[PDB]
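Postdoc handover notes: sequence design on the structure in folder B. Input C-alpha cells:
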C-alpha cells in the first residue's frame, strides 16, 4: 500500500473493477428487491457544470447506499438532447445540431464515467435518436385519434426580424430579446394536449405523494388552480345595450369564488376582448387605446401577479341580481379572455386586489363580512378582510349572520331560483400547447391533405425522421423551407400532401424517459410490459427545484396517459422527490472605458489568513471582488468541474459537493472547502496506512464485548452510534453533510483511543471496516481501495454495516 493518497493511481483502477464486476448493469431479476434511483437527465450542452456534479453525486450516494443494502439498483443516465442550444450553436459555429449534440454526448459521458457514478450505461438513451422519439410520435397519434391531442388556432409572438416565434419570456417591452424589433401577435394553428381533462386526477393524486416536499405539491395545486365558485349573471341595464348581440345584450355573466360577498360588489370588470368592451369602445378612443395595449401585452405567467393593475370605465351598467344595485362595467388588464367568462365582479372590502384597484380609482368599498369585533377601515387593507373561515355576513339583508359555506349555499339557491346563476367549478390550468416553430426537435407525426384533413402518420410508418443534415441559418425555421422533407403523399388517399413542419415541445421527451430506461432497446412499444411490471415506478427522483411545476406536472400527466393506454400500471411516476439547491460563486470584474463592468472567470483569478483583493492570474492587474450568485455565463462565474477533477480527483469533487451544504441549500464554491475535502481524504488514507503499518489486518471485533476495556467499549459505542446516524442520514433525512461529520467524529475518537493491544487492534479493524463502508457511497474510489487493504471480501458483498445493539447498552452503576 502506497504511503500517500494519489487519486490518479486509484480511481481508474476502481472504475475498471466495478465495470468488470458489472455491479451497475442490472436486469429484471425477480430474486432481488428492485430500487429505481433516477437523477434528472442533462441537456448535452458541451461539458458538465457544477450543478450536474452535485445532482449526480446525490443520486449516486443514494444508489450506492441501496446497493450495499442488497437492492437491485437501477441508476440510468441519458441525454435530453433536443432544443434550442444545438440550434444556436449551429448558427454560431456553422455545424449540424446533430453533430454538435453527438460530440457533446461523447465528451460528457466520459466526464460522468470519470466521476465514478454507478450508472447502468447499457440503458443509455438519447432523445434525439429516432429509436427514442418514434414512441412519443406513436403516443401522439394514438391520443390525436382520441381527441386528447387536438389542433386549434392560438396566438403566438412573431419576431419579424429574427423570423421566429418567441415565448413571452423572450419579449421585452413588446420587442424581441435579441432583435429589438416589435413583436407581432399572430394566430396560427397549433397542437394541444387536453391536460384539463386530467385536471382533477392530477390534483387529487398529489395527496398520495407522502414523500414529496410539501412546497412542490403546493406549487402544483396552485398551478392547477381548482376553485369551487359561482356563475352569476348581471342583467345589462336598459340604457347600456347599444352594440350588443345575443346573451351579451341580456346579461353580463361572471365567475366568482366569493358569492358570499355578492352583496358587497361595487363594480364589475371585463377583459379587453369582452363584447361589452368592444361595444363601449366603439365611440371612445381612450377605450380603444386601452384595449389595444392589453392585446399587445406579453406578460409571462410567473409575472402576471406583479403586473400593475389598470382599468377604464365604460359608461355601461349592469344590475346585481341579489340587491338590485346598478354597477358600472370597467375594462381591466387583469381580466383574461379565455379564463371563465372573461368577466369578474369586484368586492374591494374583501379581496386585496380589488381593494388596491378601488383605492386607485376611488371606487366604493362596501363591508359585507365581519370577523369578531375587529374594526373595518375602508382606507387600509387588513388581512382579516379576506378571511373565509371566521367571518359572518353583515350589510347583506337576509343573509346577515351566516358563515361562508351557509351563505354560499343560500346565494346559490337564490340565484338558481331566479335563473341568475349556479355553482361552477373552474381550473386555472390551461391546455398544453406543444407546437414549436423550431428545427431541432421531434417532428409532429401529422400529414396535411386537402382531401383527408390533418392525418396522423400510421404506426407502420413511424418514426417521421428528422433529417440531421441541416445547418440552421436564422432566416426562418428550416423544416418549412425543405420541400424534400415536407412534400409527401397522403397516407389515407395517396394524394399530394404536406408533412407538418412544427416540432414538439421538448418537455415531451422528458415526460416519459423514466419509463424508457426500463427497456431502452424495446422496438415494439414505448416500454415492454415485463420491464414496466418489474421496475414499477421511480423510487427516488433527484433534480433541481426549477422543474417543480412544469416538468413534474407533465411527467405525472404522461404517466396517467400511458397507464390509460395499458403500457404501465402505476398512477404516479415518482415516489420520493429530493430537490437540490443551486450552485453559487463569487464574481469578479473590472470597470469599462464605457462606464460598465467586464466579468472575469474565477479560475483566471488569484487572491492575495486575512485576504486583501485579487488580481488576474495571467497578467497581474487587480480586479474587483463582487457579489456571490448562481453560476452562469452571464457574470462569467462558472467553475469548471473538469478543472476540479484534474486538480484533486473525483472523490474530492464528490466529497466537497456533499459536505459543503445539505442538498436543498445553496452550495457556495469555496477553494478552502475543496482543500479541506482533499485533506480529509488524505487523513483517511493515512489512518488506514498507519494502522496496517503497525501489524497488518486482523479479524474485526465481533460479538460479546464483556471484558473489553472501558476505552474500547466507548469506541465501539461511538462506532455503532455512527452507523445508526449515517444510516438514518442516507435513508431518511437525506442530509449527507451530517453523515460525513459523524464519520469524522468517529475517526476523532479512534485517534484518541489506544488500539495497540490485541483487543484494541480487533476494534480498530472493526472501526476502519465500518468507516470505509459508511463513506463508500460518497467517495467510492478511495473506500474501495482502502477496503481491499483491510479485508479480502468484495465490499459490496460485505454489505452495509450493521448496528450492534449490544454495543449501545451502557454499564450498570
Ligand atoms: C428532467 C429534465 C426536464 C431535466 C433537463 N434536461 C435539465 O434541467 N437538464 S440540465 O442539464 O440543465 O440539468 C440536469 C439536472 O442537473 C442539474 C440541475 C441544475 C440545478 C440548478 N443549478 C444550475 C446551476 C449552475 C449552472 C451553470 C453552472 C456553470 C456554468 C453555467 C451554468 N446550479 N444549480 C437540473 O435541475 C437537473 O436536475
Ligand atoms: Mg402511500
Ligand atoms: Zn388524403
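Designed sequence:
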Amino acid at each position: 500500500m502506497q504511503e500517500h493518497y494519489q487519486p490518479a493511481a486509484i480511481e481508474p483502477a476502481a472504475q475498471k473493477k466495478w465495470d468488470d464486476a458489472r455491479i451497475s448493469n442490472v436486469s429484471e431479476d425477480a430474486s432481488k428487491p428492485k430500487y429505481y434511483c433516477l437523477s434528472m437527465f442533462p441537456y448535452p450542452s458541451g461539458k458538465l457544470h457544477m450543478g450536474h456534479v452535485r445532482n449526480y453525486t446525490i443520486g449516486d450516494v443514494l444508489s450506492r447506499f441501496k446497493l450495499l443494502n442488497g437492492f437491485n439498483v437501477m441508476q440510468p443516465m441519458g441525454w435530453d438532447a433536443f432544443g434550442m442550444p444545438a440550434e444556436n450553436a449551429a448558427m454560431k459555429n456553422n455545424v449540424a445540431p446533430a453533430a454538435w449534440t453527438y460530440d457533446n454526448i461523447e465528451y460528457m459521458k466520459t466526464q460522468l464515467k470519470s466521476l465514478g457514478f454507478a450508472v447502468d450505461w447499457e440503458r443509455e438513451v438519447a432523445t434525439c435518436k429516432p429509436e427514442y422519439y418514434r414512441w412519443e410520435q406513436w403516443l401522439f397519434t394514438k391520443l390525436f385519434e382520441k381527441g386528447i391531442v387536438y389542433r386549434k388556432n392560438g396566438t403566438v409572438n412573431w419576431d419579424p426580424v429574427d423570423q421566429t416565434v418567441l415565448a413571452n419570456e423572450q419579449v421585452i417591452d413588446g420587442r424581441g430579446w435579441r432583435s429589438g424589433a416589435l413583436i407581432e401577435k399572430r394566430e396560427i394553428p397549433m397542437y394541444y394536449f387536453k391536460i384539463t381533462d386530467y385536471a382533477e386526477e392530477l390534483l387529487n393524486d398529489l395527496d398520495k405523494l407522502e414523500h414529496w416536499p410539501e412546497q412542490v405539491k403546493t406549487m402544483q395545486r396552485n398551478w392547477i388552480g381548482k376553485s369551487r365558485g359561482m356563475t352569476v349573471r348581471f342583467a345589462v341595464s336598459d340604457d347600456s345595450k347599444q352594440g350588443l348581440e345575443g346573451d351579451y345584450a341580456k346579461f353580463l355573466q361572471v365567475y366568482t369564488t366569493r358569492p358570499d360577498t355578492l352583496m358587497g360588489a361595487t363594480y364589475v370588470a371585463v377583459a379587453a376582448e369582452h363584447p361589452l368592451a368592444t361595444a363601449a369602445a366603439a365611440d371612445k378612443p381612450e377605450l380603444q387605446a386601452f384595449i389595444a395595449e392589453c392585446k399587445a401585452g406579453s406578460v409571462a405567467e410567473a409575472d402576471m401577479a406583479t403586473m400593475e393593475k389598470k382599468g377604464v370605465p365604460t359608461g355601461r351598467y349592469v344590475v346585481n341580481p341579489l340587491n338590485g344595485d346598478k354597477l358600472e362595467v370597467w375594462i381591466a388588464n387583469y381580466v383574461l379572455w379565455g379564463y371563465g367568462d372573461g368577466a369578474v365582479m369586484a368586492v374591494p372590502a374583501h379581496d386585496e386586489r380589488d381593494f388596491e384597484f378601488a383605492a386607485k380609482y376611488n371606487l366604493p368599498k362596501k363591508q359585507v363580512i365581519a370577523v369578531g369585533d375587529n374594526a373595518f377601515d375602508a382606507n387600509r387593507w387588513q388581512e382579516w378582510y379576506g378571511d373565509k373561515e371566521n367571518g359572518v355576513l353583515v350589510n347583506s339583508g337576509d343573509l346577515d349572520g351566516l358563515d361562508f359555506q351557509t351563505a354560499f349555499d343560500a346565494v346559490a339557491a337564490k340565484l338558481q331560483s331566479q335563473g341568475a346563476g349556479e355553482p361552477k367549478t373552474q381550473y386555472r390550468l390551461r391546455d398544453w400547447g406543444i407546437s414549436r416553430q423550431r428545427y431541432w426537435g421531434c417532428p409532429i407525426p401529422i400529414v396535411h391533405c386537402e382531401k383527408c384533413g390533418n392525418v396522423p402518420v400510421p404506426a407502420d410508418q413511424l418514426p417521421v425522421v428528422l433529417p440531421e443534415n441541416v445547418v440552421p441559418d436564422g432566416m426562418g425555421s428550416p423544416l418549412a423551407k425543405m420541400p424534400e422533407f415536407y412534400e409527401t403523399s397522403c397516407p389515407c388517399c395517396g394524394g399530394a400532401a404536406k408533412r407538418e413542419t412544427d416540432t414538439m415541445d421538448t418537455f415531451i421527451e422528458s415526460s416519459w424517459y423514466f419509463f424508457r430506461y426500463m427497456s431502452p432497446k424495446f422496438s415494439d412499444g414505448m416500454v415492454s410490459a415485463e420491464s414496466a411490471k418489474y421496475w414499477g415506478a421511480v423510487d427516488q427522483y433527484i433534480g433541481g427545484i426549477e422543474h417543480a411545476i412544469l416538468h413534474l406536472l407533465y411527467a405525472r400527466f404522461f404517466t396517467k396517459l400511458m397507464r390509460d393506454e395499458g403500457l404501465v400500471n402505476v398512477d404516479e411516476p415518482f415516489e420520493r422527490l429530493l430537490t437540490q439547491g443551486m450552485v453559487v460563486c463569487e464574481t469578479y470584474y473590472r470597470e469599462n472605458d464605457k462606464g460598465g463592468k467586464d466579468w472575469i472567470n474565477p479560475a483566471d483569478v488569484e487572491l492575495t489568513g486575512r485576504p486583501v483583493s485579487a488580481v488576474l492570474k495571467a497578467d497581474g492587474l487587480p480586479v474587483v471582488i463582487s457579489g456571490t450568485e448562481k453560476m452562469s455565463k452571464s457574470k462569467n462565474n462558472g467553475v469548471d468541474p473538469q478543472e476540479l477533477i484534474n486538480a484533486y480527483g473525483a472523490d474530492t469533487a464528490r466529497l466537497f459537493m456533499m459536505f459543503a451544504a445539505p442538498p436543498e441549500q445553496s452550495l457556495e464554491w469555496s477553494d478552502s472547502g475543496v482543500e479541506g475535502a482533499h485533506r480529509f481524504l488524505r487523513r483517511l488514507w493515512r489512518t488506514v496506512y498507519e494502522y496496517l503499518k503497525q501489524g497488518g489486518a486482523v479479524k474485526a471485533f465481533a460479538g460479546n464485548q464483556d471484558g473489553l476495556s472501558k476505552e474500547l467499549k466507548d469506541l465501539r459505542h461511538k462506532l455503532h452510534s455512527t452507523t445508526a446516524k449515517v444510516s438514518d442520514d442516507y435513508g431518511r433525512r437525506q442530509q449527507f453533510n451530517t453523515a460525513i461529520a459523524a464519520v469524522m467524529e468517529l475517526l476523532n475518537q479512534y485517534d484518541k483511543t489506544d488500539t495497540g493491544s490485541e483487543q484494541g487492534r480487533a476494534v480498530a479493524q472493526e472501526v476502519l471496516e465500518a468507516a470505509v463502508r459508511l463513506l463508500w457511497p460518497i467517495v467510492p474510489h478511495i473506500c474501495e481501495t482502502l477496503w481491499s487493504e483491510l479485508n479480502g471480501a468484495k465490499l459490496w458483498e460485505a454489505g452495509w454495516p450493521t448496528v450492534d445493539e449490544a454495543a449501545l447498552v451502557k454499564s450498570e452503576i
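Context for whoever picks this up: The chain has 25 helices and 31 strands. Don't rerun without checking with the PI first.
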